[model samples]
Target chain A: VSQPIKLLVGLANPGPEYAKTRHNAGAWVVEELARIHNVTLKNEPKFFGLTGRLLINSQELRVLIPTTFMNLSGKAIAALANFYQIKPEEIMVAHDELDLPPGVAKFKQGGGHGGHDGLKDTISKLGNNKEFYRLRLGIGHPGHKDKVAGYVLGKAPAKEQECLDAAVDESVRCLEILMKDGLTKAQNRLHTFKAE
Target chain B: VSQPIKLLVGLANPGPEYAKTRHNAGAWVVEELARIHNVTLKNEPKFFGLTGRLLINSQELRVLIPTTFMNLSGKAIAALANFYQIKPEEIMVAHDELDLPPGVAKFKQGGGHGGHDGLKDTISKLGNNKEFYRLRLGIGHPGHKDKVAGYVLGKAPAKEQECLDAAVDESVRCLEILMKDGLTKAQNRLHTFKAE
Candidate 1:
């Protein structure tokens, strides 16, 4: 069996309004994984992550779903990483992405949140370490020049939802590749995911 | 044979440090929706619900407004929902998003955030928005570039944040049907989403 993953961190805000937004992209990806593994978030204090484990094929994966807002995401991840002594690269950030297309996901072995507040907080809590893995789920930006904030706080169109869902499903499965294989392998496997 | 949705909306700041994390989002969306629907959030205030309705297949979908923190979202949703109705399919939301790879969005009818304060907080109070519709806007991840307050609590990347702005703008500016569909659809349609 593969060694326990230091942590599978999912970053998101806390509440109903924010739940369905793009920022909770990480959580969306993780949720898919949870459903597949039949893992439920059993709360654990001290760590901001919604703790869970998967007995998939006998391999135990220590999953952490952060309960912190975007900015403070790091603190939660850091806390768990420190407690578990998991290396930075071992911890994966399954979150939304703007660089790539919507529903398009990229697996990077830790560079940065690229401007994510949660990732920013996570870095601060972890002393600014740049070695965590990230499952960057794409969320296309289709708004006007003004009303930017409104866009992020608004809803998406009805037609393109199918595209986004496919990516989320793929992202969730990427975890298996990471667990059974490793970050590099997972990245390679899902590196070139296309919307069909 | 589904009844109208009791869309539970949460409003607050995005973090422990922010008093208005999830609350702000909830207030903002409800206010907007109410404005368009020609309704008022200043209703009876029974069970914390700002009752209203919208056209959905000729049925008036009742929505609930939760004036609670994002983390404490359940209280508002549960309270408001309980006061009037209990149709899981009719439950919907509008909140922040940190997962859309910085500044992208994908809306849906229902799902889960990897780990969210509001969702977790409400689970104790409202169990979760599993059956509700979610309008998640892309609120760039905290540290796509790892800048603590610069992400959620902080402002966008100046004009540089355009990518994120556009992604979120899509959600905020009003894109129908797409925001209320299956999970993967959002990603696919928005996969190549760009801000400019």
Candidate 2:
């Protein structure tokens, strides 16, 4: 089995303009996690993000929401990981995924970026290491490739937003299991999750 | 007129495997520049690349060939730029351009990445700053987008290699004019250049 996650990163662009966009879905999950765990995320310029610490099952977990734009997420990630001496396998990166519809979330380990700029940059910044776990939060794809940029940056409709929120709650529950039980157990639980 | 270039970066992946590939065209030009200027590039871990200093027309210029992979070129650039206090407008990044056919070279300022991973990462690491100049060494595109990855990573044909070499020489001449005269003079000469 892989190493337990020591660092959890939520990929998103900073500023109020992007706060409610579909692209910020990953950040929403991390913010929710922070709130639930009572961890206070503070602006940490050295790490190039908002950072906090969480203790789950007596193990400390580092949480981060990168302040850099989606394409530059790797810069912030590399800084924090390098400073903490975190290994690639010991980290989990959460980002919006277009392949899955809203209300669905999946756990994946060591794969291609699938054209996601954030994942692409993260893999690049980590010295081409792809061993880290990925928390894929479904954001649904535009019918055509040309509309992808606009689709991701735009806000989701109310119904889809509700589904996204339900998915985030399920994902948080899965994270608890992941931190306590391990990958096999967490994957089993999350893979079967269906948001209403 | 814009500020004189304080840093000149040639983007490429490291190691012998990529040394002769089409993607390394940028590095080839910078390596030649280092040789002509009598600058010895040393492996600098802090800068994450082979770095050297050049003095031309009594002005100092920093030269770099990032050892990091193409997608991580920004990390090395940011390290060097931050260390030397270089501004975005005072830097020039030389790289392979697929849009322009082989035997062609162009000079551009403040533009998009055009789907080039190296340029994308550079723009990202530079805090979304697209003000840096680009020394585009055309490598020509594969017939289709799917073949681009293989085309760029593969070695150029003998005839194409010759055309690329000639283009590089012309680009070097353009750089000299850019330093001695200014952007206007350099663009006028380079825009009309044709490789035989």
Candidate 3:
């Protein structure tokens, strides 16, 4: 409903070291979509990430995985968004959310980062614009605060990965609805919808 | 001595909002050197920031401001460094240092990050290689971690700026020494030198 979601950013660091970590859950979702659509993400040094363009519902969408580490995720996004004239609201950020349980994903728009460094940097580099949409993919949290750093960077247990995979696949199904109708529709379906 | 310090990187967020902030003290030094040499840094989308080449002591040096913001500073530097085949030890990073008082500067090669998020990202993107050189430009500190965020982002006072300026100027003067003699000579002089 709001400019057809011009850009989709999957927040993650580059390299195999981070490829399968819980913190890269957002990248997993983005990669899922790319796979389904048969699109290849090419490394663009200038854009500071692997990039690809897709046409869904006859609307052009720009997708990116910032090569800049987690805290600097905003740099690549800002580069592409500013060049394409995409507004903050018109962009959707896919990032892992520790507060939510694994296998769950939610859609929300514009709020405080709540101590997520990636979101913090995004807002800062967006020139202090907090209007961007967030597609928060749940990675779940370790029981304690101290374990969080290790947890987010650790690979999920094999048992948990299947659950996360299902959630990612489910999120992909709602992408079209998100692009065509808007955030509310996606949120409504995701919040009430259950997975097998 | 070590590849003649091929790449000089000043870590900072891109945008005028950050251009004059305390956190960008590293950027100020890089810019000062450029100004002294009359080298123009051009914003290259591919390079991920403003970049310029300088022939100092008859050796080519690549200088840049990552434009990826503070936390993501490594991405841009890594991109260029990798392309040019510069080794980790061959790169120099200039950044704000809270440990040292204003008007002071220090040079060191590799060590722990000591909780600097910018340096943290730099280390991560450098494949966890902590062998790079650091040019520490003092900006003083706020005496409390809670105030650190505001302190780094705040504009420096006119009096403090003079002290910082002197440090930067002196660092600039030692550019040749840094390239020819290596880190120790620069560190020894900076550690004992007094400012006007």
Candidate 4:
């Protein structure tokens, strides 16, 4: 049985310099969700992130975009989860995916971090629990491992940004379905999405 | 008295975008030392950072700049230390300090992380080992906690950059003194330095 996600985490490095970078694709989706749902995220020192609460289908959901840098993202996640008593299984982490190109997004349950520092720390902080859901926002690879750090942190060109934006919009819709329906239904919608 | 330093680590986020940021002050110092000693830092995947070796006063010292982002710096530090059997007290970490102005740099044994994620993770990764030495390159505070993330990640203006550079140069000299003489001698010289 699929559990309803009580916490939606968007992995990102804090500061305006990183706001538009490809690494922040996850955060962009969460911010858009907040905007659409009229949820106001406020700086929460205890949580080490900007946090907000919203009722989706009458069930409470919390959104977090860690103010900590990308590598320490787990600190924010762990703090919020422990305080709220949110189980690892009830959390969903959205992060950039290098394996997929822009214009694509995917939903999966429990997996390796695949060298994403944000996810790697999150898994460690969550007591090595890999049961949480993931919304992987495709950002495309830079072709070689050496170029990854630069590519992810750099801003996407206009054409790629357009594709990413479209993907984000679709991911949001998938999230709505996930909350209202279940994981299978959400995956069906998201996995089938293609940028126009 | 003081054990000879075996490993020197400079903490900073990877990527060119962060190269000139205030947060990389510590890294700047290490880079200067590398340049002066003519040690070439090569990408060492096993160490999770750039690593170089140089002989200072006939004592071999390994210098590292973690290619991992600032928050995950400890991973690189721990990896290198564990591989080389470097004890906690034999390692020195250089990092930015918010409490001091750009022109100032200081040396200390260790204490708390002072809300710096790099230090926080470094301490944790070192198995709660806070005995490592620290070379604090002052970047100055941003006046308020809210402004800190942006301020540290943003590149300093020309005047501030000049001051920081001078501090780095002096810090490199202090490191030499520390290696040849001891901590107390290094502290006296570094503590007396002022930007001109």
Candidate 5:
């Protein structure tokens, strides 16, 4: 708890344009986290993004979101990280995964994007070092290769959305565990998630 | 507005993972409009998706978001549109455009998505009825073709974050213009943009 987490990146495009799409998973979790944590993602251009602070047991946890639409997400994050000299582990990314399910989630530390353009770019920008932490929301892939992009950019069906909303609400607990436990424990406990 | 515009499809993936990425632009706008209009996108499994309504100047506007990710985004939307007998024009889509700058927005009655998969699938799903209204938010293109995906998916930079925040904030205005003067007039009036 002594090492302050000055920045946490909810990687997503900024706009009304992408609220429910698969790619904005990071943003989705961040919003859920905020709702559950009683925090706000108010605008903050000076920090190069949106920010909120949450306190649990007297710990002031500062969260920053890169408004830099999703693809170039790393620049703003890295800039602030470098400025604050916050170690990679201090930064966390909340995003989406095709290999996962509608209400599932996982946490991991240092890995390749597995074909996600946003993650690949972030890894490259941060020197491809396995330093930062990431939270992956499961958004099952559309069965067809041709329909891949369609699936990522559209909304979830009704039951799926309900299941997802519940999942998001559940994921709030993960952030708390993350703040209390280090990345490894959180990853082990939070990464393997089920819809329930 | 009285012919029953039951499906204002704001394309986006479901769950928290894809909440804020550039690819989720369409979804983001839908949420903002709902917020301004005091609408809720409740999960409607019997309707086959999440559906809701909003009022603009006494006109009742029903909205739906396809949470089936981007590619399969079409099927969910197509089904709803068909069931509701909604015309293409009534089927507005919200998505990100690399060609547009951050925070800059425009609404067009009908057009190709350039290279966006969500747009492409939408065309196919709607029986090639390419006359729906579209709300396009500029995320700007990456410098090179090889970087297109990453660019689209990558996060925004320091200044770019300002653009994203501005776009989301400006969406309320865009919605008003769309509701008042239709797509073309809105495009004509508020096309130019600068990052905040």
Candidate 6:
């Protein structure tokens, strides 16, 4: 199950302004991974983002936080992936999922952006490539388009925050497996924990 | 107190991604004023923002939402001000503040940006002209630099949200006076509510 994930792109709006919202759930998970590895993401202007690297079980993993606003995420992604000679499939993008509740986390590869502008921009920048793996962190949706914008940018309620905390813990439980076994075993273990 | 105010510029990061964050408090207050007048702010790319105008007690006041992200706000502000011959003194920028608690609002004339990057950029763009008015919406601070970034961008808890609601209501009470007699009368009325 060691497929060798080269980089983890955490989808988020840069700055202190967006750090606490549900919109940063993806970034939170990436932060968790960085914490686990005892690495700090530093601002790397050349990469147009905050980037850090570490060796994990012999796999070199780079974590990036795009300095561009949400819609321009692909600019950083493409720049990093292209320069590193990493294919789309070799990267894992951690992002907040509107459809999934706070307690559930899932992994999927190659799909539409589901109206999330950040992912849509990423797709366009990757040359319409959607083959990158995704670590979908659920923030849950508010069930209406008009409210969607507000809800994502706002904080989750205290109860939901607890659920999301658990989801992050469970999702990362499969991180090494995600790199080792690829998507199959990773999904099985994630879903088994999801049922709990 | 209808001071014939010509324009109210609400400062925030533009785009749906940031539209609902605490950082968008300025834009939200601007929205409230627009709602009071029943005028819709529409995108005007040439002006670098959304603009709409209407007659308020015979005072044609324009409501503008700068489309630029926070740090580049001055571009929109200066562009519109210059085109309309509106001096910095004639404009009031509503923006989120980290110093005051959520329920408090204040009026200030021509001061330092207080570490607010948006205001800093506005100052830079205005050529160090700090002659404008600011309607400071308090989002409060986390009292620590490390936590401040996420705190401002995240949602307010319910209790704090109520305080902010009252602050907005009280601030708008002075909107007319803000235009008529300028900062003096507006400060008087707003302070009365600040005590409450």
Best by DockQ: 4
Which lDDT tens digits does candidate 4 get at residues B81-122?
Answer: 999999888898999999888899998887899888789989
Candidate 1 Cα misplacement greater than 4 A, ranges: A1-5, A142-149, B1-22, B25-196
Q: lDDT score of model 4?
A: 0.87
Q: Top TM-score: which candidate number?
A: 4
* C-alpha TM-scores of all predictions: 0.50, 0.53, 0.54, 0.82, 0.50, 0.60
lDDT of 3 by residue, A13-112 (tens): 5555457777788888789888887899997766667788887665677899887656767878888888889889888898888888888888888988
- Please give the lDDT score at residue A160 for candidate 6: 88
Best-to-worst DockQ order = 4, 6, 5, 3, 1, 2
Q: 2 or 3: which has the higher lDDT?
A: 2
The all-Cα superposition gives candidate 5 an RMSD in Å to the true structure of 13.0
How much is B94 displaced in model 2, in angstroms?
A: 22
**Which is superior by DockQ, 3 or 5?**
5
How much does candidate 4 score in TM-score?
0.82
lDDT score, residue B130, model 4?
97
User: Model 2, DockQ value?
Assistant: 0.02
Alpha carbon deviation, residue B138, candidate 3 (Å): 0.9
In candidate 3, what are the lDDT values of residues B23-52, reduced to their tens digit? 778888899999988999887656667799
The deviation in Å at residue B119 for candidate 2 is 9.0
Off by over 4 Å in 3: A1-117, A120-196, B2-4
**Per-residue accuracy of model 1 over A66-150 as CA lDDT, tens digit each:** 7655556776777777887777767777777767777588877667656565776677777778777777877766443222223
Let me know the TM-score candidate 5 reaches against the reference structure. Answer: 0.50
Can you give the DockQ of every candidate in the order shown?
0.02, 0.02, 0.03, 0.30, 0.04, 0.11
Docking verdict class for candidate 3? incorrect
Question: In model 5 chain A, where is the ten-residue run with the lowest total lDDT?
Answer: A1-10
Please give the CA lDDT of all the candidate structures. 0.59, 0.83, 0.78, 0.87, 0.68, 0.78
